[PDB]
């Protein structure tokens, strides 16, 4: 999703905003991710405002105290950044790819079913279009955030084609936009 970002040249095509409809943007995140309600007190404390950041191809990122929390494209669903998912790794359901798949996910590639049906992989029930955290085999922290393009049962039986779309991965353009000031 971030191809025009990773040309270095940070703080270039990104506008930040002050006064936002703050609570009007929270109540959608609890419905998207239910297991987060007891943690937005720390993630988005009411003592600190939120500041939206909009860079092009029509993406906006929610930030508090500089740190990048969620992002979305146009009016689509919110995705947590990996830096935040790392702090609270239970935000998303997990899908675990095998060790051999890391270097491919790390280069922006979508996840094929061989990546999820391998012995080193671990696939869990997930409906189509659900946001998942891409864990790797011998690794503790999420490698990627994706969205099921096929159901977990389809990935098993069909066992080829695109299983999970690669939306945001370690060392991509959003990853290197550390914080905005």
């Amino acid at each position: 999703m971030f191809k025009k970002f990773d040309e270095k040249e940070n703080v270039s095509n990104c506008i930040q905003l002050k006064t936002s409809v703050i609570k009007g943007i929270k109540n959608q995140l609890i419905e998207q991710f239910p297991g987060i309600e007891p943690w937005l007190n720390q993630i988005m404390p009411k003592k600190d405002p939120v500041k939206i950041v909009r860079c092009h191809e029509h993406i906006e990122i929610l930030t508090v105290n500089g740190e990048l929390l969620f992002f979305r494209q146009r009016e689509g669903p919110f995705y947590p950044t990996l830096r935040l998912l790392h702090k609270y790794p239970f935000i998303l359901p997990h899908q675990q790819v095998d060790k051999g798949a890391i270097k491919f996910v790390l280069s922006g590639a979508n996840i094929m079913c061989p990546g999820l049906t391998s012995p080193g992989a671990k696939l869990y029930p997930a409906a189509v279009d659900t946001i998942v955290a891409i864990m790797a085999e011998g690794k503790q922290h999420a490698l990627c955030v994706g969205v099921m393009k096929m159901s977990a049962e389809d990935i098993e039986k069909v066992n080829k084609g695109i299983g999970i779309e690669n939306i945001h991965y370690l060392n991509d353009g959003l990853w290197h936009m550390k914080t905005y000031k």
Binding site: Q42, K87, Y88, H141, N171, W175
Partner: protein
Amino acid sequence: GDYPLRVLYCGVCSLPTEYCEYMPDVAKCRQWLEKNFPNEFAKLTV
């Protein structure tokens, strides 16, 4: 609160230390880590 959890991010390539191998210069990564965090050096050494 058990979270937010703290992950050690490498200082040369900015990634979690467990993913420094898949990066171009792991030598540099391994250098910085033992100079910075010796305890998880021995962890990644095993």
